[PDB]
């Protein structure tokens, strides 16, 4: 299958990404607390539902939440201000809370059931969010011996996610809070930070073939806008 590209609503961020977030890929956004990682996740959960000529993939969403940070109210706001029915947009987001990292890992196997089910409907799953990818792993695997063990568990978790992305033509979008020499297996890593005026600034990390520079946008009632 040819890959699809989900618009973020930010012109500069779309250009930085080569058109948008890719299916058959894992995109990791990382940055400090308050940088806007979960804002970007809420935004994408609405944008992906738009038809293709408007930058979406006419798709359904699955969302694994580890910090109780999913806000239906924010989905409602973004949908309303983009011409969409908020209740319909919410209906196409399938939501689960992960209790710990082991439950988080099992929920990837669980997600495959709904992915198969919707595969030939008019709104197949096109976006899978894990927010936060790493918070449970950071809490649970800690102290002497933990670096090797945590990296092995995360490697397996990310392989399971790569398989769903690649097998079912899905964009996987994950978040990671950072206050820096560990390995990462995401397809693309985006460093996000909050700068002056509350503007948000995004930079690609280790991505030579993608456009040099930084995207800059604001958090708004429509999600994000330049």
């Amino acid at each position: 299958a040819t890959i699809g590209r989900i618009s973020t609503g930010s012109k500069s961020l779309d250009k930085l990404l080569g058109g948008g977030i890719e299916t058959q890929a894992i995109t990791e956004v990382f940055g400090e607390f308050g940088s806007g990682k979960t804002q970007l996740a809420h935004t994408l959960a609405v944008m992906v539902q738009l038809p293709p000529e408007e930058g979406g993939l006419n798709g359904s969403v699955m969302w694994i939440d580890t910090e109780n940070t999913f806000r239906p109210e924010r989905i409602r706001e973004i949908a309303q201000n983009r011409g969409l029915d908020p209740d319909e947009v919410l209906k196409h987001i399938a939501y689960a809370r992960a209790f710990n990292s082991n439950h988080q890992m099992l929920l990837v196997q669980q997600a495959e059931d709904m992915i198969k089910e919707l595969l030939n409907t008019d709104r197949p799953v096109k976006l899978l969010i894990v927010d936060s990818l790493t918070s449970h792993f950071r809490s649970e695997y800690i102290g002497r011996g933990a670096l090797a063990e945590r990296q092995q568990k995360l490697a397996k978790h990310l392989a399971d996610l790569h398989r769903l992305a690649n097998l079912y033509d899905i964009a996987v979008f994950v978040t990671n809070q950072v206050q820096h020499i560990l390995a990462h297996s995401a397809t693309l890593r985006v460093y996000l930070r909050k700068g002056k005026g509350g503007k948000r600034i995004a930079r690609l990390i280790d991505a030579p073939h993608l456009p040099e520079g930084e995207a800059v946008f604001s958090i708004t009632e429509k999600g994000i806008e330049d």
């Binding site: 699955m62 969302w63 999913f70 239906p72 989905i75 919410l90 209906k91 196409h92 987001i93 399938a94 939501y95 689960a96 669980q110 997600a111 709904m114």
Partner: peptide
């Protein structure tokens, strides 16, 4: 998973 449940609808949002």
């Amino acid at each position: 998973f449940h609808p949002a």
